[PDB]
Structure formats: structure tokens, C-alpha cells
Amino acid sequence: SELRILRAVDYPRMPGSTEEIARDGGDGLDGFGWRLSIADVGESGGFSGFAGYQRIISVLEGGGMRLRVDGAESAPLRARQAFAFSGDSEVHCTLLDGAIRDFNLIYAPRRHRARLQWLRVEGELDWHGTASTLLLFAQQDGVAISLQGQPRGQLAAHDCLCAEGLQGLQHWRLTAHEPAWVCAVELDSL
Amino acid sequence: ELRILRAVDYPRMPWKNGAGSTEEIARDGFGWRLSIADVGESGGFSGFAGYQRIISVLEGGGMRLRVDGAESAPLRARQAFAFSGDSEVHCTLLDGAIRDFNLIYAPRRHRARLQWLRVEGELDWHGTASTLLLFAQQDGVAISLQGQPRGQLAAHDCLCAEGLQGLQHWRLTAHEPAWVCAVELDSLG
Amino acid sequence: ELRILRAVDYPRMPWKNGAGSTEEIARDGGDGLDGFGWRLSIADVGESGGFSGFAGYQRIISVLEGGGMRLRVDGAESAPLRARQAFAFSGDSEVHCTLLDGAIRDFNLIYAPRRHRARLQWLRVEGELDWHGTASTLLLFAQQDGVAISLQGQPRGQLAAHDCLCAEGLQGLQHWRLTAHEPAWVCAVELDSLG
Amino acid sequence: SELRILRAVDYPRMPWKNGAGSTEEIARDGGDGLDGFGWRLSIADVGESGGFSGFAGYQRIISVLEGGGMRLRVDGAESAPLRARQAFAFSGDSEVHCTLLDGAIRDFNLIYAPRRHRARLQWLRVEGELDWHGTASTLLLFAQQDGVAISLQGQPRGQLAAHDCLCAEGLQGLQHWRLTAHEPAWVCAVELDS
After folding, report:
1. Which residues have a Cβ under 8 Å from the Cβ of A166 and sit 6 or more positions away?
2. Record: contact C148-A150, CB cut-off 8 A
3. Rounded to an integer, what distance in angstroms lies between the CA atom of residue A140 and that of residue B30?
4. CA neighbours within 13 Å on the CB side: how many for D117?
5. Mind giving me the DSSP string for A68-102?
6. How far is CA B85 from CA A169, B189, D107, in A?
7. Chain C residue closest to A166 (CA)?
8. β-pair partners for A87
9. Contact state of C86 with D121 under an 8 Å Cβ cutoff
10. Do residues D112 and D55 make contact, with C-beta atoms less than 8 angstroms apart?
11. Are the beta carbons of A4 and D77 separated by less than 8 Å?
12. Is the CB of C148 less than 8 angstroms away from the CB of A148?
């Protein structure tokens, strides 16, 4: 069991470019079970494939995008509107009005159960869940997090709590002074 | 596979001690059971040995639960609280009768998640849980799955979707804000 | 294992002389007042008077509430004893308690030194505090409300005023952490057994 | 029964063969070098990130004294950020790597043989007076800051300046320890039973 608050100031950047927040482990863009990242998309163009993986993307900032997946055009995607597609698909991204930054979850579906939900913390919100892995990404600054009643720290914009190997039902409570959007990503192995 | 359970069809069973009564919404020696209860008197809770419980007040002044000697903070509407069915538990009503919402489940058979959500216009999430119980506390919640409308819920109705496979995209909409409780269960294995 | 004892459940036994009463919090085992290895309790002392003996035992007493007391031990008068000032004396000593100004309540550890090693310390929990220890038995008494306890990073409960955590049979080095919103005094009692 | 007040001015200093830091040993029960002792207390200057040598068969407890802090990776598991006076225990048999979070730091270390010693370690903030009763046969009281006076069984035994340390061994029975200080001062009380 482990719990850490990952700081945006520590995220590495790789090649468009992507900032990886976390991964379960493994090497390269072919060796992980799951990976969470923030990407910068400055031009319309194709998305590289992640064969065998399931993808869920959300724009964070910018005018949005429209994704053509295997010839089929998605609806206009705006901030925090999660969209799921297969890494096996041929995807072209059309930027609606300029560069955007997005939030991406990529995972192997035959080995990891997943849940992804954007939530707006207004004062306080909470939930109970048995997920072994929780990634809680704060889009806006100022989200404090407690687990089983114990305060665990505060998140600044783009920081992300990462908890792994949790066992049993967990009670998570988020608090904030001003409305703050966060994305809760939960994963379970096999 | 996918049904919308209607409150008019829920059975009601009074408690042996006359302190309340329970309306069972759904159940899978059960693996899990979801119910609504009227609690009119303070008193102890019958045990559900080996089960995990999560209780939430739906209306009324609230309650305070004493679990194996530990007194909870005051519990008001939609403040979920978890405790073991093996624990000794006494419920003290804070200010009169209340109605609650309860999940009881076998932890060694099902993984579980429970969250109160206020649908303001629309909200959505993607999830892989095999079973979703979406309870509407208020009227007017429409639910779509994978972009396909699946119906609407009136106050206290509950969507029950079982045996779901793969990532699901759930969207809830309401013309006027409405509180719902999303309970997700999966058969671990 | 680990249990939090609640003050509302402590039994109360009036002293046969009517000068007070005792509420036993816990004991390792054994019967009566001469058969235990260690015993923790809270006593009410309503009048000045002699203290009954606990032959062969080491005692550590602390005032909890009230103006305080002065103990005359084998003829030597102690300095005035006020809240949370632990004082050790032998159960073999002749002891007279003089109440300074009215009734008091005290916290008492009585133990057999040939069977148990002991440590006792009043700690004021201001936000957070932690320590590592190998003691097999930990009794953590909260004088004031609001202390949350975690062991090895895991929350284990919360104590209201006069509640007491009792952990026995602990093996190896333990990491204990206490947290409180409003400052709260606690008394950490650690015991280890001969052998 | 012996009681000594060790002065920081008299501590030895051993530079690490790898050049990443140095260790100033405060006290030890016995032996020579990095083994043979039942216990050892020391302060260290950690100038750079890097692995920690092992101390096979020993239990370790480390606390940062000055600096931003560090994260310790123990057998692959990265600890939370460790800041001043936050003690952290780990095995001397473990593989450990230290990552400095913001520059060089000074730390305080306890290493002891678990098969032969019971141990307790607690950072205490002395403001005015504080006392406790204990039966430990050995007490090491390290003062991080100046101004702490110590009494045992009612008898004043000395005063500690920053980084000085009281070492008491062979103690018998229940002891009444009392620390007093005017301006707040952190001390770390280490108790070892034979």
C-alpha cells in the first residue's frame, strides 16, 4: 500500500509533446498496464496508435477538438468531456480553434478495470470505493484530500494524488475553498 | 440486463423491534442488497455478520451511530457512512424519524463503490463495473448508456443494470437538479 | 490485540471508607486487587485520608481534575501535586493524601516491577506527534477529547475524554502517531513483560 | 550506572568512502567501525543523493535535522517526503537510496541490534518543563537546540548546548527524568533496554 501526491513541477516531458503523470510500471509506450498524462496538441493531425490499449481523452484547455475514429466523426469535444476510443483505431484530431491541452488515460482493458469521472468540488464531496488504485487529478488549485478520515495533503493545479495497493472499502473526501474541477481515475488489476 | 425498478413495486418489512421498517429495492445469503428504511425510534441495528454496510440518511434530522463503542459525528442527508455488519451498532435519532438508504454487500464476493451525485443539467462518467444501481432521490433523472437513452427515474426509483461488460459511458440528465446515488458493484475474480 | 476502551463503560467501585471510588480501566489479568500484573484506573478522591496499600507494587499517580493533593509518603510530604504531574511511590509505603482544595480525580498506574518494565509520560498533542517504540503493551489515555491514533500509518480510532487505547501483544518496532484539532493531553503508558 | 554529557565539539567525523557525506558518531555501546556495536547514535551530513551502505542485521531510525528534506527508496518503495524531525524506520538489511529534495541536509541516526535491544525514539519539544518516568537501562537525550537542562531522580545532571547529548547507561529501576528549557528547544529521547 502506498500513497503519494505527485507534483506537476515534477512531470517529465516526452516528444506534439506529452507530460507523463504516472504509470503502473514498465518501459516505453508499449510496456505499461496504465498510463495517465497531459498532452499538448498544437496542430490538427493523426494520433499515434497504442495497439491493444483502451484510451479515454478529455480536453483541459483550448477551443476543443473533434476526433475522427475509423472514419466516424465525434461530436465537438470541449473541456472535461471525456471520450473513449480504441488504441487500435485510426484517429485524426481536428482542432476547433487553436491549440489545446488534454488529459489522457491509456490502459490495457483485459488486465485493468477502470473508472473515470470529472467532479467539481464545491466545499466538500466524498465517496466510498474499493478500488486498489486511485489517481485524483486536480485541474484547478486547492483540493485537500482525506482518506479514512486522515488528511493526506493538498493539491495545486495539475498535481495528482496516486494511491496504490489499497485494500478494502476506502472513504475519500475532497475539500476546496473555491470550486475546483478534479478527475477521479480508479483502477483495479485483472 | 437493464431494468428500471419502480418504487411502487418495493416490498416493505417492519422491523421486529418496531423501531422501523425496510423497503428492499434489489438484491443479487445474498451477495448484495439495496434498500430504503424508515427509522422511527432509536435502537440497535440487527447484525449482518460478515457483510460490509454503507448507510446514508435520505431525509429527516439525521442520526448518530455508535459502532463498537465509537460515536459517529452527526449524520445528515446524503452523508454516507460505512461500518461492518459484525459490529455492535446503536442508532440515535437526532431529531425525529428519518428515512435512510442502505447498501449491504459481501466484501469477499463484490468490489463496491458508492457516491452521492447532484445532477445539475448533465453529468457523465465511464466505468467498467458489471453492476450499476442508480438510485434517484428526486424526480426527473434521465439515463443514457453508450449514448442511447434508457429511460427516466421518478423519486426513489432505481436503475439496475447487471452483467455489464467493457467500458460503459453513463450520462445522467435532469431539467431541474436532482440527487442520485450511484452504487457500482463488480464480481471480483 | 487493539481496542479502544470507553470511559462511559468503566465500572465504578466505591471505597469502603466512603472517601472515594475507583474506576478500573484495564488490567493484564489475574483476580482481585493483589492478583494482577498491572492495572490502570481513575479514582475519585472526595476526602483527605490514607491510601490503602498495594503491597509489592510500584505506583505512579497523576492528578487529572481538581485543585490537587499533597501525598505524605512514609512521613515525607510531597510538593503540591497538580494536574498531570506524575508522582511515583511504593505500594509498600504508608501514604496519606491531603486534598488541597476539594475533591479531585486521579489517574493511576499500579504494576509489579518484578514482572513488568514501565514508562509513563503525559504528552500534549498539538496538531500531531509521533514516536517509535518496541513496547509490547501500550495504554494511551486521553484526558481531553479529540485524539486520533494511527499505528504504522493506519488510522485505528479516536478517543473522547477519558477514553483509553489498549494495545497488547505488540511485536517489533511500532510507529505511533496521534493527531488532534484542539490541543489535547494524553498519557502514554508502555509496559514490557519479564522474559 | 553511568551518566555522561557528550559535547558536539568532541564528536569524531568520518567522511564516507563514496564522498557523498560524512558521519559524526555521538555514541555507541561498543566495537570498532560500522559493526560490533549493540547500538550507535550519530549525526550525518548528506551532501548528495545516492545509496546508503547497509548495516546487516541492524534496525535503523533516521530523522532529518536541517535542510529541505529527503525521500528514501527502501527495497524499491519510495517514502513520503521526510522533513525535519520526522523519524523514519527501515532495515539495515534493505537496499536504500536517498534523494535530496532541496540541497544538503543534516540527519540524526539511531542504529541498533533488535535481537539484543528494546528501543524507543521520540522527538519532544521542551517549553518550560516536561518529565516522564521510565525503566529503560540506557537513555540518550540529544538536543537539537541550546538551553535544555536535565534532572534525574530530582538531581540536576547538567545542561545541553545545541547538538550535545546526554548518555546514561546501566540505569536500574524506575527513573524520573525532567527536562527544562526557557526558549523552546527540540530534543530527541532515545531509550534502549538491554
Report:
1. A1, A131, A132, A133, A134
2. yes
3. 42
4. 25
5. EETTEEPPPB-BT--EEEETTS-EEEEESSS-EEE
6. 14, 23, 47
7. C154
8. none
9. no
10. no
11. no
12. no
Q: Is residue C97 within 8 Å of C77, Cβ to Cβ?
A: no
Contact (Cβ atoms closer than 8 angstroms) between residue B156 and residue B111: no
D1 and D53 co-located in one domain: no
Please give the Cα distance from C194 to D10 (Å, whole number). Answer: 38
- In this structure, the answer to whether residues D36 and D87 fall within a common structural domain is yes
Q: A126 touching B, CB under 8 A?
A: yes
Residue whose cell numbers read 548528495: D48
What is the spatial distance between Cα D158 and Cα C184, in angstroms, rounded to a whole number? Answer: 31
Residues D127 and D38 in one domain: no
Q: CA end-to-end span of chain D, whole Å?
A: 13
Q: What φ, ψ does residue A28 adopt, rounded to 5°?
A: 70, -175
CA count, 13 A, side-chain hemisphere, A189: 10
The amino acid at C31: D
Q: Which of B181, B172, B165, B186 is nearest to B125 (CA)?
A: B172
Residues D24 and D108 in one domain: yes
Q: How many CB atoms lie within 10 A of CB D161?
A: 14
CB–CB of A181/A139 below 8 Å? yes
Q: Which technique was the structure solved with, according to the deposited record?
A: X-ray
- Which chains sit next to A, with 3 or more Cβ pairs under 8 A? B, C, D
What one-letter code names the amino acid at B151? G
Domain end call among C113, C146, C163: C113
Structure-block grid coordinates of residue D121: 525514539
State the total domains in chain D. Answer: 2
Say if residue C102 is in the same domain as residue C172. Answer: no
Give the residue numbers spanning the domain of B121: 1-10+108-189
The 10 Å CB-count burial string (b at 16+, else e) for D137-150 is: bbbbbbbbbebbbb
Same-domain pairing of A136 and A186: yes
Nearest to A113 by CA among A35, A22, A189: A189
- How distant is the alpha carbon of residue A88 from its chain centre? 20
User: Do both C21 and C66 map to the same domain?
Assistant: yes
Give the three cell numbers for residue C143. Answer: 484526558
Residues in chain D: 194
Resolution (A): 1.6
How close C118 gets to chain D, by Cα (Å)? 6
Final residue of a structural domain among D116, D137, D159: D116
CATH of residue B159: 2.60.120.10
CA angle B68, B71, B74 (to 5 degrees): 140
Evaluate whether A26 touches A106 at the Cβ level (below 8 Å): no
Shared domain check, B187 and B136: yes
Whole-number Cα distances in Å, B141 to B3, B4, C159: 15, 12, 42
Contacts of C38 (CB under 8 A, 6+ apart): C27, C28, C109, C110, C111, C112, C116, C118, C137, C191
